[PDB]
Design an enzyme around this catalytic site. Structure first.
Site, PDB file in Angstrom:
ATOM      1  CG  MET A 192       6.135  23.391  -5.105  1.00 35.65           C
ATOM      2  SD  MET A 192       6.621  24.225  -6.767  1.00 35.65           S
ATOM      3  CE  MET A 192       7.274  22.639  -7.688  1.00 35.65           C
ATOM      4  CB  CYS A 193       4.735  24.949  -1.261  1.00 34.96           C
ATOM      5  SG  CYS A 193       4.014  26.148  -0.162  1.00 34.96           S
ATOM      6  CB  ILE A 194       1.746  22.739   2.141  1.00 31.88           C
ATOM      7  CG1 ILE A 194       1.293  21.997   3.392  1.00 31.88           C
ATOM      8  CG2 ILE A 194       0.699  22.760   1.051  1.00 31.88           C
ATOM      9  CD1 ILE A 194       2.289  22.063   4.538  1.00 31.88           C
TER      10      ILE A 194
END
Lengths: 216, 217
Positions: B134-136
């Site tokens: 998730m995210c970066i």
């Protein structure tokens, strides 16, 4: 939009705020559509603990700088908290509560509470605004308020004894429930004093936040 | 219970794992009747950031010792992670994913991924076990797998372009949804790349955890 002050004491169970408890408290506040307004005393932690080994580290850390990690930088010095701008106050647990918000971990029934926190909680209580304390945080209550309160730290007999020695009425409570001092609008829950996992902790915290919002 | 490996990179969004993402991941795993098994590489963080000011500090900290804060001490060095003992692997975000699990932050499309992490991810995929980033964290995927993957980092134009440059099929996705590469059992979601608050991050994270668990079942 209700404004709930959340007081932190560092970032991590042994020297600051219990990370799971702080994040679950923020989740409940957000889910309920309320705004969390976070603070932490701008002072050095009493110690720095290696959480992998449990031993003290030879370094120093600032309570507010560390607590800023839990809030993604959205936090201010406790000196900037104003009871007139808040609707409720919640204090997550962790050993930081007994080390940085008070010295309960080393003094027991003879401890004292952070002066900025004590003044803030007293102002909140005089305005009829609800307070929510969890895990070992309730131990400071008999030192903030000079009047008896029904509270809980879970079921620990020794901790319960110390609270009673301080003048409080300790009420045994399981992880998924809360204890409320209806006349003084103080809500307490055991959280990691008894939780065996994060879901357990969350069930009690969700109930505490909900009761606090209703009282607000 | 299914054993879900959770890889952390420190303790805090700017120099480790996003604390809300990591805790929400643990919450969804625990609530769903599964067991989180946490690891972090035992090495020094590349930096230490004052989260109040965003400034770099002149001190050094260890990724594993700091990640032990999020897990109440329940964590092991990444070197001890064994694919055969896990049913799924999830990597919460935070800048630590781009600094300690990889050097995406400083190298972008020419980056490399922590060797232990890459090896463990490849072993899980070879065994047909699902992965959730998730995210970066999804930025590492093109450098872990040498074939195109369907993934998302949200909607950031610049970051999406870097992913396409790395050979991925970037799929625009909102905070409350996930993107799945079905053939390779890879699940991604934007979390704080787009979340405006913790409830929004929890919505996407719960969906990712739920899909990973179904895929592991």
């Amino acid at each position: 939009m209700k404004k709930i002050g959340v007081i932190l004491s560092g970032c991590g169970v042994y020297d600051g705020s219990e990370i799971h408890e702080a994040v679950l408290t923020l989740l409940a506040i957000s889910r309920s559509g309320a705004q969390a307004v976070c603070f932490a005393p701008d002072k050095q932690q009493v110690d720095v603990i290696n959480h992998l080994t449990g031993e003290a580290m030879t370094e120093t850390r600032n309570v507010l700088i560390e607590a800023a990690r839990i809030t993604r930088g959205e936090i201010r010095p406790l000196a900037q908290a104003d009871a007139a701008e808040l609707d409720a106050l919640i204090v997550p647990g962790g050993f930081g509560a007994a080390k940085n918000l008070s010295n309960f971990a080393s003094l027991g029934s003879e401890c004292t509470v952070d002066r900025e926190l004590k003044a803030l909680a007293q102002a909140m209580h005089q305005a009829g605004k609800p307070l929510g304390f969890m895990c070992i945080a309730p131990a400071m209550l008999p030192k903030i308020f000079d009047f008896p309160l029904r509270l809980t730290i879970g079921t620990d007999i020794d901790t319960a004894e110390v609270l009673e020695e301080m003048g409080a009425e300790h009420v045994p409570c399981p992880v998924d429930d809360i204890v409320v001092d209806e006349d003084n609008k103080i809500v307490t829950t055991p959280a990691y004093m008894l939780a065996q996992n994060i879901a357990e902790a969350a069930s009690g915290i969700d109930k505490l936040v909900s009761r606090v919002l209703v009282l607000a």
